Design a binder for these strands. Structure first.
Ligand SMILES: NCCCC#CC1=C(N)NC(=O)N([C@H]2C[C@H](O)[C@@H](COP(=O)(O)OP(=O)(O)OP(=O)(O)O)O2)C1
Ligand SMILES: [Mg+2]
Ligand SMILES: [Mg+2]
Ligand SMILES: [Mg+2]
Ligand SMILES: [Mg+2]
Length: 539
DNA sequence: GACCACGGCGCG
DNA sequence: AAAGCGCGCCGTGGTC
Protein backbone atom coordinates (compact mmCIF):
# COMPACT_ATOMS: atom_id res chain seq x y z
CA UNK A 1 0.00 0.00 0.00
CA UNK A 2 0.99 3.62 -0.60
CA UNK A 3 2.37 5.08 2.65
CA UNK A 4 0.46 8.19 3.75
CA UNK A 5 0.45 10.61 6.72
CA UNK A 6 -1.66 10.00 9.81
CA UNK A 7 -4.64 10.34 10.34
CA UNK A 8 -6.61 7.92 8.11
CA UNK A 9 -10.03 8.78 6.64
CA UNK A 10 -13.28 7.49 8.17
CA UNK A 11 -13.96 3.78 7.70
CA UNK A 12 -10.28 2.82 7.72
CA UNK A 13 -9.20 -0.51 9.20
CA UNK A 14 -6.79 -0.43 12.14
CA UNK A 15 -3.75 -2.55 12.88
CA UNK A 16 -2.02 -2.41 16.24
CA UNK A 17 0.70 -4.05 18.32
CA UNK A 18 0.49 -4.58 22.08
CA UNK A 19 3.37 -5.34 24.46
CA UNK A 20 1.27 -8.19 25.89
CA UNK A 21 -1.96 -10.00 25.02
CA UNK A 22 -4.11 -8.46 27.79
CA UNK A 23 -5.49 -5.06 26.67
CA UNK A 24 -5.93 -3.70 30.22
CA UNK A 25 -2.25 -4.39 30.93
CA UNK A 26 -0.72 -3.71 27.52
CA UNK A 27 1.43 -0.89 26.21
CA UNK A 28 0.24 0.30 22.80
CA UNK A 29 3.49 -0.08 20.86
CA UNK A 30 2.20 0.81 17.40
CA UNK A 31 -0.94 1.81 15.53
CA UNK A 32 -1.71 2.03 11.84
CA UNK A 33 -4.69 2.24 9.51
CA UNK A 34 -5.50 1.14 5.98
CA UNK A 35 -8.02 2.29 3.38
CA UNK A 36 -8.22 2.93 -0.35
CA UNK A 37 -4.80 1.55 -1.22
CA UNK A 38 -3.13 3.59 1.52
CA UNK A 39 -1.54 2.78 4.86
CA UNK A 40 -1.25 5.41 7.59
CA UNK A 41 1.25 4.84 10.40
CA UNK A 42 0.84 6.76 13.65
CA UNK A 43 4.06 8.36 14.95
CA UNK A 44 2.52 8.56 18.42
CA UNK A 45 0.09 5.63 18.98
CA UNK A 46 -1.63 6.72 22.22
CA UNK A 47 -2.42 10.24 21.03
CA UNK A 48 -3.40 8.89 17.60
CA UNK A 49 -6.23 6.85 19.18
CA UNK A 50 -8.11 10.13 19.61
CA UNK A 51 -8.35 10.45 15.81
CA UNK A 52 -10.36 7.25 15.33
CA UNK A 53 -14.16 7.13 15.37
CA UNK A 54 -14.14 3.36 15.88
CA UNK A 55 -11.85 0.34 16.00
CA UNK A 56 -12.48 -1.59 12.80
CA UNK A 57 -10.29 -4.63 12.18
CA UNK A 58 -8.75 -7.80 13.63
CA UNK A 59 -9.19 -8.01 17.42
CA UNK A 60 -11.11 -4.70 17.40
CA UNK A 61 -12.31 -5.26 20.99
CA UNK A 62 -8.75 -5.36 22.41
CA UNK A 63 -7.96 -1.92 21.04
CA UNK A 64 -11.35 -0.65 22.26
CA UNK A 65 -10.66 -1.93 25.77
CA UNK A 66 -7.29 -0.20 25.72
CA UNK A 67 -8.94 3.01 24.51
CA UNK A 68 -11.57 2.81 27.27
CA UNK A 69 -8.77 2.22 29.77
CA UNK A 70 -7.27 5.53 28.65
CA UNK A 71 -10.61 7.34 29.02
CA UNK A 72 -11.51 7.32 25.32
CA UNK A 73 -14.96 6.21 24.18
CA UNK A 74 -13.75 4.25 21.17
CA UNK A 75 -16.16 1.45 20.21
CA UNK A 76 -15.16 -1.70 18.30
CA UNK A 77 -16.75 -2.16 14.88
CA UNK A 78 -16.25 -4.72 12.13
CA UNK A 79 -13.79 -7.49 12.99
CA UNK A 80 -12.88 -10.20 10.45
CA UNK A 81 -12.35 -12.62 13.38
CA UNK A 82 -16.09 -12.53 14.11
CA UNK A 83 -16.99 -13.18 10.45
CA UNK A 84 -14.58 -16.11 10.30
CA UNK A 85 -15.79 -17.52 13.63
CA UNK A 86 -19.39 -17.55 12.37
CA UNK A 87 -18.35 -19.29 9.15
CA UNK A 88 -16.49 -21.94 11.15
CA UNK A 89 -15.93 -21.73 14.93
CA UNK A 90 -12.59 -23.53 14.61
CA UNK A 91 -11.50 -20.12 13.32
CA UNK A 92 -10.22 -18.90 16.70
CA UNK A 93 -6.87 -17.17 16.08
CA UNK A 94 -5.71 -14.30 13.85
CA UNK A 95 -2.86 -16.61 12.82
CA UNK A 96 -5.26 -19.21 11.45
CA UNK A 97 -7.80 -16.79 10.01
CA UNK A 98 -5.09 -14.87 8.12
CA UNK A 99 -3.65 -18.06 6.66
CA UNK A 100 -7.07 -19.35 5.63
CA UNK A 101 -8.63 -16.16 4.25
CA UNK A 102 -5.82 -14.24 2.58
CA UNK A 103 -2.65 -13.20 4.35
CA UNK A 104 -0.25 -13.60 7.24
CA UNK A 105 -0.45 -12.38 10.83
CA UNK A 106 2.81 -10.51 11.39
CA UNK A 107 4.13 -8.24 14.14
CA UNK A 108 3.89 -4.93 12.26
CA UNK A 109 0.87 -2.65 12.75
CA UNK A 110 0.74 -1.43 9.15
CA UNK A 111 0.76 -4.99 7.87
CA UNK A 112 -1.99 -5.87 10.36
CA UNK A 113 -4.10 -2.93 9.18
CA UNK A 114 -3.72 -3.94 5.53
CA UNK A 115 -4.45 -7.56 6.45
CA UNK A 116 -7.59 -6.52 8.37
CA UNK A 117 -8.82 -4.66 5.30
CA UNK A 118 -8.46 -7.49 2.80
CA UNK A 119 -9.62 -10.21 5.20
CA UNK A 120 -12.76 -8.20 5.82
CA UNK A 121 -13.33 -7.93 2.07
CA UNK A 122 -12.88 -11.67 1.53
CA UNK A 123 -14.89 -12.79 4.57
CA UNK A 124 -17.77 -10.39 3.93
CA UNK A 125 -18.02 -11.96 0.48
CA UNK A 126 -18.18 -15.47 1.91
CA UNK A 127 -21.10 -14.38 4.09
CA UNK A 128 -23.17 -13.30 1.08
CA UNK A 129 -26.21 -15.56 0.80
CA UNK A 130 -25.63 -16.75 4.37
CA UNK A 131 -28.60 -14.78 5.67
CA UNK A 132 -28.69 -16.40 9.11
CA UNK A 133 -24.97 -15.96 9.78
CA UNK A 134 -25.25 -12.36 8.57
CA UNK A 135 -28.08 -11.84 11.05
CA UNK A 136 -25.96 -13.24 13.87
CA UNK A 137 -23.09 -10.96 12.90
CA UNK A 138 -25.13 -7.76 12.63
CA UNK A 139 -27.62 -8.40 15.43
CA UNK A 140 -25.50 -10.33 17.92
CA UNK A 141 -21.72 -10.64 17.55
CA UNK A 142 -20.79 -7.17 16.28
CA UNK A 143 -22.89 -5.27 18.87
CA UNK A 144 -21.82 -7.72 21.60
CA UNK A 145 -18.17 -6.85 21.02
CA UNK A 146 -18.97 -3.30 22.16
CA UNK A 147 -20.73 -4.64 25.28
CA UNK A 148 -17.80 -6.93 26.09
CA UNK A 149 -15.29 -4.10 25.67
CA UNK A 150 -17.13 -2.11 28.34
CA UNK A 151 -17.33 -5.11 30.67
CA UNK A 152 -13.60 -5.81 30.30
CA UNK A 153 -12.65 -2.18 30.93
CA UNK A 154 -14.93 -1.96 33.98
CA UNK A 155 -13.65 -4.88 36.05
CA UNK A 156 -14.93 -6.17 39.39
CA UNK A 157 -13.99 -5.25 42.95
CA UNK A 158 -12.18 -7.82 45.08
CA UNK A 159 -11.60 -7.93 48.84
CA UNK A 160 -7.84 -8.30 48.65
CA UNK A 161 -7.13 -7.93 52.39
CA UNK A 162 -9.60 -10.76 53.10
CA UNK A 163 -7.96 -13.07 50.55
CA UNK A 164 -4.48 -12.35 51.95
CA UNK A 165 -5.71 -13.33 55.41
CA UNK A 166 -7.44 -16.41 54.01
CA UNK A 167 -4.21 -17.58 52.33
CA UNK A 168 -2.47 -17.78 55.71
CA UNK A 169 -5.29 -19.83 57.25
CA UNK A 170 -5.38 -22.21 54.29
CA UNK A 171 -1.59 -22.59 54.36
CA UNK A 172 -1.67 -23.86 57.96
CA UNK A 173 -4.34 -26.43 57.14
CA UNK A 174 -2.44 -27.52 54.02
CA UNK A 175 0.60 -28.06 56.25
CA UNK A 176 -1.46 -30.27 58.58
CA UNK A 177 -2.73 -32.37 55.69
CA UNK A 178 0.63 -32.81 53.95
CA UNK A 179 2.38 -33.78 57.19
CA UNK A 180 -0.30 -36.39 57.85
CA UNK A 181 0.00 -37.69 54.29
CA UNK A 182 3.78 -37.99 54.67
CA UNK A 183 3.43 -39.80 57.99
CA UNK A 184 0.98 -42.26 56.43
CA UNK A 185 3.30 -42.78 53.47
CA UNK A 186 6.17 -43.32 55.91
CA UNK A 187 8.21 -40.64 54.14
CA UNK A 188 7.96 -37.19 52.52
CA UNK A 189 7.72 -36.71 48.76
CA UNK A 190 6.34 -34.01 46.44
CA UNK A 191 2.61 -34.34 47.08
CA UNK A 192 2.01 -31.94 44.18
CA UNK A 193 3.50 -34.59 41.88
CA UNK A 194 0.87 -37.06 40.73
CA UNK A 195 3.71 -39.27 39.44
CA UNK A 196 5.26 -39.52 42.89
CA UNK A 197 1.83 -40.02 44.47
CA UNK A 198 0.96 -42.83 42.04
CA UNK A 199 4.01 -44.79 43.17
CA UNK A 200 3.19 -44.25 46.83
CA UNK A 201 -0.43 -45.33 46.53
CA UNK A 202 -0.14 -48.23 44.12
CA UNK A 203 3.43 -49.51 44.58
CA UNK A 204 4.35 -48.69 48.19
CA UNK A 205 0.94 -48.96 49.83
CA UNK A 206 -1.25 -51.90 48.88
CA UNK A 207 -3.87 -49.95 46.95
CA UNK A 208 -5.48 -51.33 43.77
CA UNK A 209 -5.26 -49.19 40.64
CA UNK A 210 -8.73 -48.49 39.26
CA UNK A 211 -8.20 -46.41 36.14
CA UNK A 212 -5.59 -45.22 33.66
CA UNK A 213 -4.76 -41.76 32.31
CA UNK A 214 -5.61 -40.80 28.74
CA UNK A 215 -2.39 -39.88 26.93
CA UNK A 216 0.34 -41.81 28.74
CA UNK A 217 -1.60 -44.61 30.44
CA UNK A 218 -0.31 -44.06 33.96
CA UNK A 219 -2.34 -45.31 36.91
CA UNK A 220 -4.76 -42.46 37.60
CA UNK A 221 -4.92 -40.63 40.93
CA UNK A 222 -7.95 -38.56 39.90
CA UNK A 223 -10.71 -37.59 42.35
CA UNK A 224 -12.98 -40.29 40.95
CA UNK A 225 -10.33 -42.94 41.63
CA UNK A 226 -9.62 -41.62 45.14
CA UNK A 227 -13.34 -41.48 45.97
CA UNK A 228 -13.58 -45.19 45.17
CA UNK A 229 -10.55 -45.86 47.39
CA UNK A 230 -11.79 -43.82 50.37
CA UNK A 231 -12.27 -46.81 52.70
CA UNK A 232 -9.14 -48.69 51.63
CA UNK A 233 -6.63 -46.50 53.48
CA UNK A 234 -6.66 -43.39 55.70
CA UNK A 235 -4.24 -41.58 53.36
CA UNK A 236 -6.87 -41.28 50.63
CA UNK A 237 -9.24 -38.84 52.36
CA UNK A 238 -6.21 -36.79 53.42
CA UNK A 239 -5.09 -36.55 49.79
CA UNK A 240 -8.57 -35.50 48.66
CA UNK A 241 -8.62 -32.72 51.25
CA UNK A 242 -5.08 -31.62 50.31
CA UNK A 243 -6.12 -31.48 46.65
CA UNK A 244 -9.16 -29.30 47.31
CA UNK A 245 -7.24 -26.82 49.41
CA UNK A 246 -4.14 -26.57 47.21
CA UNK A 247 -6.28 -26.24 44.07
CA UNK A 248 -8.18 -23.30 45.56
CA UNK A 249 -5.11 -21.62 47.05
CA UNK A 250 -2.88 -21.97 43.98
CA UNK A 251 -5.54 -21.03 41.45
CA UNK A 252 -7.60 -18.34 43.21
CA UNK A 253 -6.59 -17.24 46.70
CA UNK A 254 -2.95 -16.48 45.87
CA UNK A 255 -2.97 -15.27 42.21
CA UNK A 256 -6.05 -13.01 42.19
CA UNK A 257 -4.96 -10.33 44.70
CA UNK A 258 -1.80 -9.85 42.62
CA UNK A 259 -3.90 -8.96 39.56
CA UNK A 260 -5.69 -5.86 40.85
CA UNK A 261 -5.20 -3.08 38.31
CA UNK A 262 -3.25 -0.11 39.75
CA UNK A 263 -5.45 2.51 38.05
CA UNK A 264 -8.90 0.98 38.50
CA UNK A 265 -8.32 -0.91 41.73
CA UNK A 266 -10.40 -3.70 40.20
CA UNK A 267 -9.87 -7.14 38.65
CA UNK A 268 -10.22 -7.26 34.84
CA UNK A 269 -10.88 -10.38 32.74
CA UNK A 270 -10.94 -10.96 28.98
CA UNK A 271 -14.18 -12.11 27.38
CA UNK A 272 -13.08 -14.11 24.35
CA UNK A 273 -15.64 -14.03 21.56
CA UNK A 274 -14.06 -16.50 19.14
CA UNK A 275 -12.88 -19.25 21.48
CA UNK A 276 -15.45 -22.07 21.70
CA UNK A 277 -16.95 -24.68 19.37
CA UNK A 278 -20.53 -23.96 20.44
CA UNK A 279 -20.82 -20.17 20.52
CA UNK A 280 -20.22 -19.77 24.26
CA UNK A 281 -17.88 -17.02 25.40
CA UNK A 282 -14.79 -17.91 27.35
CA UNK A 283 -13.05 -15.84 30.01
CA UNK A 284 -9.31 -15.57 30.58
CA UNK A 285 -6.40 -13.78 32.22
CA UNK A 286 -7.82 -14.44 34.77
CA UNK A 287 -10.76 -16.70 33.98
CA UNK A 288 -13.67 -15.31 35.99
CA UNK A 289 -16.16 -17.89 34.74
CA UNK A 290 -14.80 -20.59 37.06
CA UNK A 291 -14.72 -18.86 40.46
CA UNK A 292 -15.41 -21.52 43.14
CA UNK A 293 -18.85 -21.94 44.70
CA UNK A 294 -19.48 -25.64 45.50
CA UNK A 295 -17.49 -26.21 48.71
CA UNK A 296 -17.32 -24.22 51.98
CA UNK A 297 -13.86 -22.83 51.12
CA UNK A 298 -15.01 -22.19 47.56
CA UNK A 299 -17.91 -20.15 48.88
CA UNK A 300 -15.53 -18.15 51.09
CA UNK A 301 -13.55 -17.27 47.96
CA UNK A 302 -16.60 -16.29 45.92
CA UNK A 303 -17.52 -13.92 48.77
CA UNK A 304 -14.37 -11.92 47.96
CA UNK A 305 -16.08 -10.59 44.82
CA UNK A 306 -17.84 -7.50 46.12
CA UNK A 307 -19.83 -4.47 45.04
CA UNK A 308 -18.28 -1.01 45.10
CA UNK A 309 -19.16 1.00 48.21
CA UNK A 310 -22.64 2.47 47.73
CA UNK A 311 -23.48 -0.18 45.13
CA UNK A 312 -24.89 -3.71 45.06
CA UNK A 313 -24.27 -6.73 42.88
CA UNK A 314 -27.22 -8.13 40.99
CA UNK A 315 -26.96 -11.74 39.83
CA UNK A 316 -29.34 -13.19 37.23
CA UNK A 317 -29.36 -16.84 36.12
CA UNK A 318 -31.59 -18.62 33.56
CA UNK A 319 -33.45 -21.53 35.16
CA UNK A 320 -32.83 -25.03 33.71
CA UNK A 321 -31.77 -23.29 30.51
CA UNK A 322 -30.54 -26.14 28.32
CA UNK A 323 -33.54 -28.30 29.25
CA UNK A 324 -35.92 -25.52 28.20
CA UNK A 325 -33.96 -25.08 24.97
CA UNK A 326 -34.13 -28.83 24.32
CA UNK A 327 -37.90 -28.71 24.78
CA UNK A 328 -38.11 -26.03 22.09
CA UNK A 329 -35.70 -27.71 19.67
CA UNK A 330 -37.22 -31.18 20.00
CA UNK A 331 -40.84 -30.10 20.26
CA UNK A 332 -41.46 -32.84 22.82
CA UNK A 333 -44.95 -32.30 24.21
CA UNK A 334 -44.14 -33.98 27.55
CA UNK A 335 -41.09 -31.80 28.18
CA UNK A 336 -42.86 -28.64 27.02
CA UNK A 337 -45.71 -29.58 29.39
CA UNK A 338 -43.27 -29.94 32.31
CA UNK A 339 -42.21 -26.30 31.93
CA UNK A 340 -45.73 -25.02 31.27
CA UNK A 341 -46.63 -26.58 34.64
CA UNK A 342 -43.78 -24.79 36.43
CA UNK A 343 -41.95 -27.99 37.42
CA UNK A 344 -38.25 -28.39 38.27
CA UNK A 345 -36.45 -31.39 36.79
CA UNK A 346 -33.28 -30.80 38.84
CA UNK A 347 -35.25 -30.83 42.10
CA UNK A 348 -37.20 -33.91 41.01
CA UNK A 349 -34.04 -35.86 40.13
CA UNK A 350 -32.53 -34.74 43.45
CA UNK A 351 -35.52 -35.96 45.46
CA UNK A 352 -35.10 -39.33 43.77
CA UNK A 353 -31.31 -39.37 44.18
CA UNK A 354 -31.23 -38.76 47.93
CA UNK A 355 -34.54 -40.52 48.54
CA UNK A 356 -36.32 -37.58 50.14
CA UNK A 357 -39.47 -35.57 49.35
CA UNK A 358 -39.11 -32.66 46.91
CA UNK A 359 -39.37 -30.16 49.77
CA UNK A 360 -36.42 -31.78 51.56
CA UNK A 361 -34.07 -31.08 48.64
CA UNK A 362 -31.41 -28.54 49.62
CA UNK A 363 -29.42 -26.48 47.06
CA UNK A 364 -26.36 -28.77 47.31
CA UNK A 365 -28.58 -31.77 46.56
CA UNK A 366 -30.12 -30.01 43.58
CA UNK A 367 -26.67 -29.02 42.30
CA UNK A 368 -25.61 -32.66 42.51
CA UNK A 369 -28.70 -33.54 40.46
CA UNK A 370 -27.73 -31.04 37.74
CA UNK A 371 -24.62 -33.00 36.80
CA UNK A 372 -26.70 -36.18 36.70
CA UNK A 373 -29.45 -34.65 34.55
CA UNK A 374 -27.09 -33.19 31.95
CA UNK A 375 -24.65 -36.09 32.20
CA UNK A 376 -27.39 -38.56 31.32
CA UNK A 377 -28.86 -36.26 28.64
CA UNK A 378 -25.53 -36.02 26.84
CA UNK A 379 -24.59 -39.69 27.02
CA UNK A 380 -23.27 -40.64 30.46
CA UNK A 381 -22.68 -44.38 30.88
CA UNK A 382 -24.64 -46.47 33.39
CA UNK A 383 -21.37 -47.63 34.96
CA UNK A 384 -20.30 -44.07 35.73
CA UNK A 385 -23.88 -43.32 36.76
CA UNK A 386 -23.96 -46.28 39.14
CA UNK A 387 -20.50 -45.32 40.35
CA UNK A 388 -21.17 -41.65 41.10
CA UNK A 389 -24.51 -42.53 42.72
CA UNK A 390 -23.10 -45.54 44.59
CA UNK A 391 -26.14 -47.50 43.43
CA UNK A 392 -26.02 -50.90 41.68
CA UNK A 393 -25.41 -50.88 37.90
CA UNK A 394 -28.95 -52.18 37.49
CA UNK A 395 -30.40 -49.07 39.16
CA UNK A 396 -28.32 -46.72 37.00
CA UNK A 397 -29.49 -48.34 33.75
CA UNK A 398 -33.09 -48.09 34.96
CA UNK A 399 -32.77 -44.36 35.65
CA UNK A 400 -31.43 -43.75 32.13
CA UNK A 401 -34.18 -45.72 30.39
CA UNK A 402 -36.91 -43.82 32.26
CA UNK A 403 -35.18 -40.48 31.70
CA UNK A 404 -35.65 -40.91 27.94
CA UNK A 405 -38.86 -42.96 27.86
CA UNK A 406 -40.50 -40.02 29.62
CA UNK A 407 -39.54 -37.63 26.80
CA UNK A 408 -39.93 -39.50 23.44
CA UNK A 409 -39.21 -36.73 20.91
CA UNK A 410 -35.83 -36.00 22.48
CA UNK A 411 -34.16 -39.15 21.13
CA UNK A 412 -35.91 -38.46 17.83
CA UNK A 413 -34.47 -34.94 17.76
CA UNK A 414 -31.03 -36.37 18.53
CA UNK A 415 -31.24 -38.93 15.72
CA UNK A 416 -32.44 -36.30 13.23
CA UNK A 417 -29.72 -33.88 14.31
CA UNK A 418 -26.99 -36.51 13.87
CA UNK A 419 -28.36 -37.75 10.55
CA UNK A 420 -28.45 -34.16 9.28
CA UNK A 421 -24.95 -33.49 10.59
CA UNK A 422 -23.70 -36.49 8.62
CA UNK A 423 -25.32 -35.15 5.45
CA UNK A 424 -24.29 -31.50 5.66
CA UNK A 425 -21.08 -31.90 7.65
CA UNK A 426 -22.27 -29.52 10.36
CA UNK A 427 -24.94 -29.02 13.00
CA UNK A 428 -26.55 -25.73 13.93
CA UNK A 429 -28.24 -23.74 16.70
CA UNK A 430 -31.76 -22.30 16.54
CA UNK A 431 -30.35 -19.13 14.98
CA UNK A 432 -28.14 -20.99 12.53
CA UNK A 433 -24.73 -20.81 14.21
CA UNK A 434 -22.79 -23.78 12.81
CA UNK A 435 -20.29 -26.30 14.09
CA UNK A 436 -18.55 -28.65 11.66
CA UNK A 437 -18.32 -32.25 12.86
CA UNK A 438 -16.51 -34.38 10.23
CA UNK A 439 -15.98 -37.22 12.72
CA UNK A 440 -19.70 -38.11 12.51
CA UNK A 441 -18.62 -40.32 9.62
CA UNK A 442 -15.57 -41.77 11.38
CA UNK A 443 -15.21 -45.54 10.89
CA UNK A 444 -13.89 -45.92 14.43
CA UNK A 445 -16.84 -46.30 16.82
CA UNK A 446 -15.38 -44.59 19.92
CA UNK A 447 -14.27 -41.63 17.80
CA UNK A 448 -17.59 -41.50 15.97
CA UNK A 449 -19.61 -41.73 19.19
CA UNK A 450 -17.53 -39.04 20.90
CA UNK A 451 -18.25 -36.88 17.85
CA UNK A 452 -21.96 -37.65 18.10
CA UNK A 453 -22.09 -36.43 21.71
CA UNK A 454 -20.29 -33.23 20.67
CA UNK A 455 -22.62 -32.79 17.71
CA UNK A 456 -26.03 -33.09 19.37
CA UNK A 457 -24.88 -31.10 22.41
CA UNK A 458 -23.89 -28.10 20.29
CA UNK A 459 -27.36 -26.95 19.14
CA UNK A 460 -28.52 -27.01 22.76
CA UNK A 461 -25.52 -25.35 24.42
CA UNK A 462 -25.14 -23.04 21.43
CA UNK A 463 -28.78 -21.93 21.38
CA UNK A 464 -28.60 -21.09 25.07
CA UNK A 465 -25.40 -19.17 24.28
CA UNK A 466 -27.09 -17.27 21.44
CA UNK A 467 -30.00 -16.36 23.72
CA UNK A 468 -27.70 -15.00 26.44
CA UNK A 469 -25.70 -12.97 23.91
CA UNK A 470 -28.88 -11.46 22.46
CA UNK A 471 -30.03 -10.62 25.98
CA UNK A 472 -26.73 -8.88 26.75
CA UNK A 473 -27.03 -6.84 23.57
CA UNK A 474 -30.58 -5.77 24.48
CA UNK A 475 -29.85 -5.19 28.17
CA UNK A 476 -26.64 -3.16 27.92
CA UNK A 477 -28.12 0.14 26.68
CA UNK A 478 -30.90 -0.03 29.30
CA UNK A 479 -28.28 -0.36 32.04
CA UNK A 480 -26.21 2.52 30.71
CA UNK A 481 -29.37 4.63 30.90
CA UNK A 482 -29.86 3.62 34.54
CA UNK A 483 -26.24 4.18 35.54
CA UNK A 484 -25.76 0.46 36.18
CA UNK A 485 -22.83 -1.66 35.05
CA UNK A 486 -22.67 -5.09 33.41
CA UNK A 487 -19.67 -6.84 34.99
CA UNK A 488 -19.58 -10.55 34.17
CA UNK A 489 -21.25 -13.24 32.10
CA UNK A 490 -20.96 -16.86 33.27
CA UNK A 491 -22.70 -18.71 30.42
CA UNK A 492 -26.32 -18.45 31.55
CA UNK A 493 -25.68 -15.92 34.30
CA UNK A 494 -25.10 -12.17 34.37
CA UNK A 495 -23.60 -10.18 37.22
CA UNK A 496 -24.42 -6.48 37.26
CA UNK A 497 -23.44 -3.66 39.60
CA UNK A 498 -26.05 -1.01 40.42
CA UNK A 499 -26.32 2.02 42.70
CA UNK A 500 -28.06 0.84 45.90
CA UNK A 501 -30.98 3.20 45.31
CA UNK A 502 -31.60 1.67 41.88
CA UNK A 503 -30.62 -1.94 42.57
CA UNK A 504 -34.17 -3.28 42.91
CA UNK A 505 -35.34 -1.49 39.75
CA UNK A 506 -32.32 -2.74 37.80
CA UNK A 507 -32.89 -6.32 38.99
CA UNK A 508 -36.53 -6.28 37.85
CA UNK A 509 -35.69 -4.73 34.50
CA UNK A 510 -32.82 -7.12 33.76
CA UNK A 511 -34.97 -10.13 34.64
CA UNK A 512 -37.70 -9.00 32.24
CA UNK A 513 -35.23 -8.28 29.45
CA UNK A 514 -33.66 -11.71 29.90
CA UNK A 515 -37.00 -13.55 30.06
CA UNK A 516 -38.46 -11.68 27.09
CA UNK A 517 -35.40 -11.80 24.82
CA UNK A 518 -36.64 -14.40 22.33
CA UNK A 519 -39.72 -16.35 23.44
CA UNK A 520 -39.65 -20.11 22.96
CA UNK A 521 -42.34 -22.79 23.14
CA UNK A 522 -41.69 -22.84 26.88
CA UNK A 523 -41.31 -19.88 29.25
CA UNK A 524 -37.81 -18.69 30.03
CA UNK A 525 -37.50 -18.10 33.75
CA UNK A 526 -34.73 -16.06 35.32
CA UNK A 527 -33.78 -16.22 39.00
CA UNK A 528 -32.43 -12.99 40.43
CA UNK A 529 -30.63 -12.03 43.62
CA UNK A 530 -29.12 -8.87 45.07
CA UNK A 531 -26.20 -8.58 47.49
CA UNK A 532 -22.98 -6.92 48.65
CA UNK A 533 -21.01 -9.87 47.28
CA UNK A 534 -21.30 -12.47 44.52
CA UNK A 535 -22.21 -15.30 46.92
CA UNK A 536 -24.87 -13.27 48.75
CA UNK A 537 -26.28 -12.11 45.42
CA UNK A 538 -26.91 -15.72 44.33
CA UNK A 539 -28.83 -16.65 47.48
C1' DG B 1 12.95 -16.73 31.22
C1' DA B 2 9.32 -19.05 27.91
C1' DC B 3 6.87 -23.23 25.74
C1' DC B 4 4.91 -27.53 25.88
C1' DA B 5 1.86 -31.87 27.08
C1' DC B 6 -0.20 -33.92 30.73
C1' DG B 7 -3.15 -34.94 34.61
C1' DG B 8 -6.08 -32.88 37.15
C1' DC B 9 -9.99 -29.90 38.45
C1' DG B 10 -12.36 -25.18 38.96
C1' DC B 11 -16.93 -23.44 36.65
C1' DG B 12 -21.28 -23.64 33.39
C1' DA C 1 -11.65 -43.70 35.20
C1' DA C 2 -16.00 -45.02 33.08
C1' DA C 3 -19.84 -42.97 26.24
C1' DG C 4 -21.88 -36.51 29.28
C1' DC C 5 -20.74 -31.59 26.61
C1' DG C 6 -18.03 -26.67 26.79
C1' DC C 7 -14.00 -23.98 28.63
C1' DG C 8 -8.92 -21.99 31.25
C1' DC C 9 -5.26 -22.49 34.86
C1' DC C 10 -2.68 -25.05 38.19
C1' DG C 11 2.05 -27.61 39.12
C1' DT C 12 4.91 -31.11 37.31
C1' DG C 13 8.14 -32.86 34.08
C1' DG C 14 10.38 -31.69 30.36
C1' DT C 15 12.55 -29.03 26.59
C1' DC C 16 14.97 -25.05 24.60
N1 LIG D 1 -19.93 -28.26 38.06
C1 LIG D 1 -21.10 -27.41 38.14
C2 LIG D 1 -22.24 -28.15 38.84
C3 LIG D 1 -23.61 -27.64 38.35
C4 LIG D 1 -23.66 -27.80 36.88
C5 LIG D 1 -23.74 -27.96 35.72
C6 LIG D 1 -23.83 -28.15 34.45
C7 LIG D 1 -23.34 -29.32 33.96
N2 LIG D 1 -22.81 -30.23 34.81
N3 LIG D 1 -23.38 -29.58 32.65
C8 LIG D 1 -23.90 -28.69 31.79
O1 LIG D 1 -23.93 -28.94 30.56
N4 LIG D 1 -24.40 -27.47 32.27
C9 LIG D 1 -24.97 -26.52 31.30
C10 LIG D 1 -26.45 -26.89 31.18
C11 LIG D 1 -27.12 -25.85 32.07
O2 LIG D 1 -28.48 -25.63 31.70
C12 LIG D 1 -26.24 -24.63 31.86
C13 LIG D 1 -26.37 -23.59 32.98
O3 LIG D 1 -25.93 -24.14 34.21
P1 LIG D 1 -26.73 -23.80 35.56
O4 LIG D 1 -27.31 -22.40 35.54
O5 LIG D 1 -25.85 -24.19 36.73
O6 LIG D 1 -27.88 -24.94 35.45
P2 LIG D 1 -29.40 -24.68 34.97
O7 LIG D 1 -29.54 -23.31 34.33
O8 LIG D 1 -29.79 -25.88 34.14
O9 LIG D 1 -30.23 -24.79 36.35
P3 LIG D 1 -30.58 -23.56 37.35
O10 LIG D 1 -29.95 -23.97 38.66
O11 LIG D 1 -29.96 -22.33 36.73
O12 LIG D 1 -32.09 -23.56 37.42
O13 LIG D 1 -24.92 -25.16 31.75
C14 LIG D 1 -24.37 -27.18 33.58
MG1 LIG E 1 -29.07 -21.56 35.12
MG1 LIG F 1 -25.81 -20.55 35.94
MG1 LIG G 1 -5.78 -30.22 28.72
MG1 LIG H 1 2.84 -35.52 34.18
Amino acid sequence: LEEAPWPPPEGAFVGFVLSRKEPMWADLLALAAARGGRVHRAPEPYKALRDLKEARGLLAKDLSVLALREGLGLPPGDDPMLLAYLLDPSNTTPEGVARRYGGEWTEEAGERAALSERLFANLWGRLEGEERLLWLYREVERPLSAVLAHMEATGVRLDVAYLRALSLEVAEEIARLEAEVFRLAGHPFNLNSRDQLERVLFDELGLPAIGKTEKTGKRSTSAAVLEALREAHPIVEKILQYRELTKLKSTYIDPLPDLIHPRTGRLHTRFNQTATATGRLSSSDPNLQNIPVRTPLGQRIRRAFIAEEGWLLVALDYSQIELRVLAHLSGDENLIRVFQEGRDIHTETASWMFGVPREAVDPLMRRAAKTINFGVLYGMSAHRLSQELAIPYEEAQAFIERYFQSFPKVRAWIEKTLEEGRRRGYVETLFGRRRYVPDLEARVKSVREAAERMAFNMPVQGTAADLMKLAMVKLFPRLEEMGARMLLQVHDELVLEAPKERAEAVARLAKEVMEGVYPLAVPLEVEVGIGEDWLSAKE
